[PDB]
Design a protein around this ligand. Structure first.
Ligand SMILES: CCn1c(CSc2nc(N)n[nH]2)nc2c1c(=O)[nH]c(=O)n2Cc1ccc(Cl)cc1
Length: 127
């Protein structure tokens, strides 16, 4: 089983904004998770070929990863913070749905999700 095309990170049709909540999502939320020891499985689209996960994209129909998120943030793909928060939550959900409780990768996602929640609890006020 081949990999699918990755999620888009560029779309000139899509209206864009650069905003203080999006800026926080990049410089605080993404940066915190990206630097973590457990980030590496989440820093790029799942390569089902290299990882020998031939059923991954049969089960996961909304792939998402931090490499995509980082590019969406840096390339101002989003209109609002909720879009980006949803991408992180999609990524965590994918991991929990595909894998088994207690698997290493689920523990890794949990650790990142804890930090995500701690940072989005203090999402700033819109300017
Ligand atoms: C979170 C996505 N993911 C990736 C990362 S897919 C990847 N793509 C590329 N290019 N590098 N890593 N491995 C995964 C998964 C996933 O959901 N489920 C899995 O069982 N694996 C195998 C695995 C990898 C690392 C650890 Cl520590 C434990 C298990």
């Amino acid at each position: 089983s081949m990999n699918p095309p990755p999620p888009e990170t560029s779309n000139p049709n899509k209206p864009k904004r650069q905003t203080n909540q999006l800026q926080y999502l990049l410089r605080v939320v993404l940066k915190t998770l990206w630097k973590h020891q457990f980030a590496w499985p989440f820093q790029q689209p799942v390569d089902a070929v290299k990882l020998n996960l031939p059923d991954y994209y049969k089960i996961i129909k909304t792939p998402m990863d931090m490499g995509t998120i980082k590019k969406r943030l840096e390339n101002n793909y989003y209109w609002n913070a909720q879009e980006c928060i949803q991408d992180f939550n999609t990524m965590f959900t994918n991991c929990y749905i595909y894998n088994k409780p207690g698997d290493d990768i689920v523990l890794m996602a949990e650790a990142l999700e804890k930090l995500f929640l701690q940072k989005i609890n203090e999402l700033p006020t819109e300017e």
